[PDB]
Structures are given as C-alpha cells and as structure tokens.
Amino acid sequence: AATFNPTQSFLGFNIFPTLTALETQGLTRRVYDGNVTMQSGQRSLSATGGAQNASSGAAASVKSGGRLEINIPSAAGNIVRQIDYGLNLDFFSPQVAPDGTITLRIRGQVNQPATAITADSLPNLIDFTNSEAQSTITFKNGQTILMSGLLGSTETTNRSGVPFLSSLPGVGAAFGEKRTEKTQSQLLVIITGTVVK
C-alpha cells in the first residue's frame, strides 16, 4: 500500500519494522483397557427402570464416565432416556466352541460432552465429541485381533503478502505473513480373550 504526496516531503528514510513468530506443539493420549467375564449363551438383562438405554440388549457391559438422565413429557409418549459418556463397552451374543474359538459382537465407544452441562442446559440438542466402532470378530483362545483402526492427517499452510515477493523461498516472509499447521491422529480397537477354567 504505497502513496505519494506532492505537497510535502519527509526528512530522510525511516523503516518502522515489526516482527512476529510463533511455534506450538501438542499431544493427547487416552487409553482404556476393559475386561468382562461372561458365559457362552449369555442373554441380555431387562431392568432399565423405565428409561431407554443403548446398552439394554447387551449380554455384558462395563461403563465409566457420566450419564445424562432425560425426562421430557410428551403427548405421543414421554421421552425418558439415558445417555452415557466416557467409556462404553458392550458385548453381544458371545458363543464359544469346544475348541476355544470365541465369536462375539463388540461395540466400544469413547465420548465426552463438547461443552459442560450447567443445569441451565436443555436436552433438545447436545454436542458430544464421539468415537465409535462395531463389528463381529472371531478368534481362538489367547489370540489378538484388531477390530478397527483409523489414521488421520490435516494441513492448512496459508500465506499472504506482496505479489511475487511473499512467495520467494526463505526471504518471502519479509513481505507478508506465513502460517502452517499439521495434525495426526490414531485410533485402535484391539480384542483378546481367554477361556476361564
């Protein structure tokens, strides 16, 4: 942004520069290891206290985290729900063969509320950071199998400034800005099991 003034004239040369530079890193880990003991032809349990839960039909379960209780009266049937966050592990239909081969349906889920529940919240819309998987696997007694995996990556790499000068290698940042970001992620769900004599 250059201008010319034909009526005045500055004295000498002034440069008035200003520099800015920033660097950052982060690293988040979160690990869960859950055991459940169960039987071959195990059925689900129907207690539910009248509320609806996504793990009602599971033969076995383990949870750790929180739980939202929702009681909304309606003329088409009341909305009475339970939403669980934290860690949820559900096991469905765990048949075992005389060899020791285990067949099983596993869900597994890690989630958190995106923003805290503050007693002024309404149950009409909730945001819930979430990661989930579900499938059926078969393995023999003592083996280890990966049910699901997910690898991610991003990059943004912006740049701005003077035409043809901000794009020069190295000295380009003397004529504008520059910014770059990179992200990585990994999610692994691993299953093993043994027969308990």
């Binding site: 007694n141 003592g142 280890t144 199998i145 990966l146 995996g149 691993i190």
Partner: protein
C-alpha cells in the same frame, strides 16, 4: 520408498521359545527390507528385534516366525518396521 504405514491385524497365541508365531497384516513388505520388534512399549520404544534366522515365511500379508531363546517373558508390544516405517502395534504375551 516406503510411504504407507503397515497395519497389523492378527497375531497368534503362546509364543514360547520354539513355538511358531504368525502375524497378519497389509503392507508388510519383505524379509530383506523389514524386521519384527518385540518387547517394546506402547510407542514402539525399547524392544529387541527378531533375528533373521527366525523367519520361516514372509509375505506382504503374513509373517511366520520361530521364537528364539532369550526373549523377555510377559506382556509387551509387537511392531513391524518396513523400510524404517513403523506399523500399528499389537500386544503379545511371551511365555
């Protein structure tokens, strides 16, 4: 030369010295390009590599090994390093 991360999908049980350990994956490469590391932690650090004489078969989707004498018994992590690139790990139990 190796850009894709190898994926470990299944390992067998047992792993006592003299037993056969089978690993199944996707981009597992060659026995002349890669190596198997056992006894590592969650991040792949530490651990000892299998000798090249322990390899019975090595396809890009299956590795068959003979467990030598002197591996650390107990639970640990197993990785495959293909062309210097580390795979996703699996937990293995050395007897």
């Amino acid at each position: 030369g190796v850009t894709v991360t190898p994926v470990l999908i299944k390992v067998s049980e047992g792993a006592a010295p003299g037993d056969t350990l089978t690993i199944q994956g996707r981009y597992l490469g060659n026995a002349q390009t890669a190596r198997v590391i056992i006894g590592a932690d969650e991040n792949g650090q530490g651990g000892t590599a299998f000798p090249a004489s322990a390899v019975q078969s090595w396809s890009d989707t299956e590795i068959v090994l003979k467990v030598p004498e002197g591996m650390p018994a107990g639970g640990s992590w197993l990785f495959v390093e293909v062309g210097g690139k580390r795979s996703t790990g699996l937990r293995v139990s050395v007897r």
